[PDB]
Design a binder for these strands. Structure first.
Ligand SMILES: [Zn+2]
Lengths: 135, 112, 77, 91, 180
RNA sequence: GAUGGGGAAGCUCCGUUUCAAAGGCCUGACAGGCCACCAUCGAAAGGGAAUCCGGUUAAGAUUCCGGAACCUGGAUAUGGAUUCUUCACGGUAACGUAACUGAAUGUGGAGACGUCGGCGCGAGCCCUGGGAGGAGUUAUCUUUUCUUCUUAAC
RNA sequence: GCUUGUGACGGCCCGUGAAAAUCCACAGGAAGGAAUAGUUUUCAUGCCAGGUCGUACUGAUAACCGCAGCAGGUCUCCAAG
RNA sequence: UCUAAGGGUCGGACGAUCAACUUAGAACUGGUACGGACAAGGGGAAUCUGACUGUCUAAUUAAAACAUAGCAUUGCGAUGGUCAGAAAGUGAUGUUGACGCAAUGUGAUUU
RNA sequence: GAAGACAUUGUCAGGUGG
């Protein structure tokens, strides 16, 4: 079956975001005119959140838990599946086939997912995702 | 045929004291002292040549900016773009197999 | 030395407080079958690097020679 | 074409150094310079160099071996007795 | 000895080797300058400080690059690895073995040579092993030995057929050629 | 080839990191903490930061003069970029652009590397067509013979 | 076409044909920092400075060594028709 | 003085343009001489020796002398073998370990 | 770790012995 889904998590293998985890939102098994291959709109991060401890202050954790999102189109072959998953309904409509244009769209689309990942990582769900794969 | 003089005091045909000839405005040939070649930097895992990088003399790298000695992704100025891909998924799969051994050991100690 | 393609870029290199001196050169060359036209070369002593500008038209030369400041020390040829 | 009857591959040395020696050096010269089977690729692209080494350009892997072969009969028998003795001692 | 990369030595008998094992990895396999046998750049993780500690083992046959070595005392019996000789039974063929524990090897080092454990004195620990010459000798168990023959057996079978090859041979080790 | 050290009746010798208390920091309130070597000498032909042309003298020039570039090490102002989403964006990817912080420690790369053969590529020189200039043979023949027509560093 | 340089290949060996100073990057992330304003001096511009010594000459059937201005000897580049 | 063969670049069976010296083949000709100069192997039938490339008695000897790869033997398992130091907390082989280290007679081959 | 009142080191006496 098409075990790849849009509530799914994956990894990047190439193109300036490898070694960083992502999530699928919109697969296209035969692509489009542009992106003429099986691709998927995805989102992930660019700067992982640093670890925190007991003794850190509010300001320290505030500095450490800033996080950089990203959104990109990718060939399927340049990813790897993952058994883990994530809740995806929050940021479905902000991203779109047209959202990768006129980056007034793109930057707000980054900011929504920035707040989303921040509120998620605080009271951390998907700890495995939010921690950096080491390599 | 005009004949040419070494400009430096080393007379010998060494690796370094090399000679390219070039004709000049004033109408007399002279020798011109080329310097040694670069080499492609290489892959610490692959032993392969890696792209995007300027083949420059080693101190000469200090002049150029960050871009020419680098590419964008992680493991930029050292690696192959395939050896990275191999090791990353190695680190992912055996990271999952750590969980596999976790479920094995917790199963047998639960049996104990 | 370096070459210029934009004059709106150019016109502050002549005001950048490193220049004291600059010059103009004129050149006699022929375009494809064309006709023999003079060709202006405005050169300016940027101290770290000489900046030039090649121009074929003479009306633009008369424009720029007047547009440039009076204090700047130019020579010809 | 097969351009000779019995001298074969070592004919560059010529008429020198004796036939009884030419035979043995020929026997080893065919063995050293041929291309051998990769354990991993399964390809006849495995070449020696700097005697003792054996190297597949395909998949870039290298392995030690005989001075003039990939592997010895002693390698075979120690491999087989190890396959025995590992299973014997482990259980 | 210009080009001699490093002595064909063993690791030291540290706490890991002595109460457990360790995984150590080969990076390449290189021809020694003036040796009948090849060597192996092989690396471990120094467990007291954060770095990858290089080691220079002798290259037994069968071993390839991209290979691991579990090694110490609790290592599974496999080619390329190392143990002190008490855990194995008789008959396990080894090489590059030690005279005393931690001397990093005197015996069974040359090309295509090996030694053959035949006996044990488990109480009052020793181990009985034959030499390539064939002289029997019983030594303590805590000293070690690498599995398998030294690679390159049959280096000796080939003649040389001309003097320049012998000059190229004996330029490298020692000026013991031309001999009277 | 020093010092440590040990011998030597002794001049001085064996040895070169080893039977050594060998050296310096990093915050931070005189107390805690980390690191690990070992000297130094030896290549005007090996490695190695970076320059060209023209002119000039009785005699030297990659040295001087005229012009034009480069390297290293400093300070420090501006421009530009990044940012109220603080440590840029784009491209499937190969990788890119004018930049786009970062210590201790770790890892990797260059420096760093044979001989011979044949094959390709380009540089210089050689053969030379046409044109424009200068010289020379021409009793007789030769739309001829010779020379110039160039352009660096960066 | 001649010489020379480089490249991609191939052979060649029980010969496999050096190490260091130096430079750079990468992983790592101690920590620092903006909104009424900072950060970036590995981008561009802009400013001062670069010390000691050698440097001429010949390099040879006269400039050196051969008791000498000796039919001798001394490493090497350019190499036309 | 001729012929034939050996090519690129441009068009959709072949054609237009562009250029090289390589060989072969047929004539005509004169001192019947012609690699014309210069440069440039004399060859062969028998006997013996060392196997060979190679090395040397500069300044009376350049071999049937020396080394050579091979063959066979002997020694040594590290407190070891060879070898050295004024003595040492010494030192080479040795960053080595019996397919090794070292000394032997002998020198390719058939037998 | 091995070895241990033996070794060994300092000094004496036999056999052999260019
Ligand atoms: Zn392979």
């Amino acid at each position: 079956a098409k075990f790849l889904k849009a509530g799914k998590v994956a990894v990047v293998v190439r193109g300036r975001y490898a070694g960083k985890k992502v999530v699928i939102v919109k697969p296209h098994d035969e692509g489009s005119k542009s992106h003429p291959f099986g691709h998927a709109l995805v989102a992930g991060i660019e700067r992982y959140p640093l670890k925190v401890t007991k003794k850190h202050g509010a300001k320290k954790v505030a500095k450490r838990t800033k996080i950089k999102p990203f959104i990109k189109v990718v060939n399927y072959n340049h990813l790897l599946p993952t058994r883990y998953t994530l809740d995806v309904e929050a940021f479905k409509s902000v991203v779109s086939t047209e959202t990768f244009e006129q980056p007034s769209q793109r930057e707000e689309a980054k900011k929504v997912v920035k707040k989303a990942f921040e509120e998620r990582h605080q009271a951390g769900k998907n700890q495995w995702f939010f921690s950096k794969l080491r390599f | 045929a005009q004949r040419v003089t070494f400009r430096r005091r080393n007379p010998y045909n060494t690796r370094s004291n090399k000679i390219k000839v070039v004709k000049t405005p004033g109408g007399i040939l002279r020798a011109q002292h080329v310097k040694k070649l670069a080499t492609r930097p290489k892959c610490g895992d692959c032993g392969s040549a890696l792209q995007g990088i300027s083949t420059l003399r080693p101190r000469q790298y200090a002049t150029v900016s960050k871009t020419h000695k680098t590419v964008s992704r992680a493991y930029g100025g050292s690696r192959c773009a395939n050896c990275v891909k191999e090791r990353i998924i190695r680190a992912f799969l055996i990271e999952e197999q750590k969980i596999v051994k976790k479920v094995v050991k917790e199963q047998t100690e639960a049996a104990k | 030395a370096r070459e210029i393609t934009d004059i709106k870029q150019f016109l502050e290199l002549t005001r950048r407080a490193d220049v004291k001196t600059a010059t103009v050169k004129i050149n006699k060359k022929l375009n494809k079958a064309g006709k023999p036209f003079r060709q202006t070369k405005f050169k300016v002593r940027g101290s770290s690097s000489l900046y030039t500008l090649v121009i074929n038209d003479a009306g633009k030369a008369k424009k720029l020679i007047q547009s440039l400041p009076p204090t700047l020390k130019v020579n010809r040829l | 074409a097969k351009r000779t009857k019995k001298v074969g591959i070592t004919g560059k040395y010529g008429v020198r150094y004796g036939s009884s020696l030419r035979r043995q050096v020929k026997k080893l010269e065919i063995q050293q310079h041929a291309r051998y089977d990769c354990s991993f690729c399964g390809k006849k692209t495995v070449k020696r160099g700097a005697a003792g080494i054996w190297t597949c350009s395909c998949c870039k892997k290298t392995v030690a071996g005989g001075a003039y072969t990939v592997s010895t009969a002693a390698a075979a028998t120690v491999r087989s007795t190890i396959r025995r003795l590992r299973e014997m001692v482990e259980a | 000895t210009r080009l001699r990369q490093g002595a064909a030595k063993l690791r030291t008998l540290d706490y890991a080797e002595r109460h457990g094992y360790i995984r150590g990895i080969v990076k390449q396999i290189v021809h020694d300058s003036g040796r009948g046998a090849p060597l192996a750049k092989v690396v471990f993780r120094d467990p007291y400080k954060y770095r990858l500690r290089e080691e220079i083992f002798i290259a037994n046959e069968g071993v390839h690059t991209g290979q691991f070595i579990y090694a110490g005392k609790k290592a599974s019996l496999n080619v390329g690895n190392v143990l002190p000789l008490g855990s194995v039974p008789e008959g396990t063929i080894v090489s590059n073995v030690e005279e005393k524990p931690g001397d990093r090897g005197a015996l069974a080092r040359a090309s295509g040579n090996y030694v053959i454990i035949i006996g044990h004195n488990p109480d009052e620990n020793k181990t009985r092993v034959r030499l390539p010459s064939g002289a029997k000798k019983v030594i303590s168990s805590d000293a070690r030995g690498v599995i398998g023959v030294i690679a390159g057996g049959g280096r000796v079978d080939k003649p040389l057929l001309k003097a320049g090859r012998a000059f190229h041979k004996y330029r490298l080790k020692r000026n013991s050629w031309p001999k009277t």
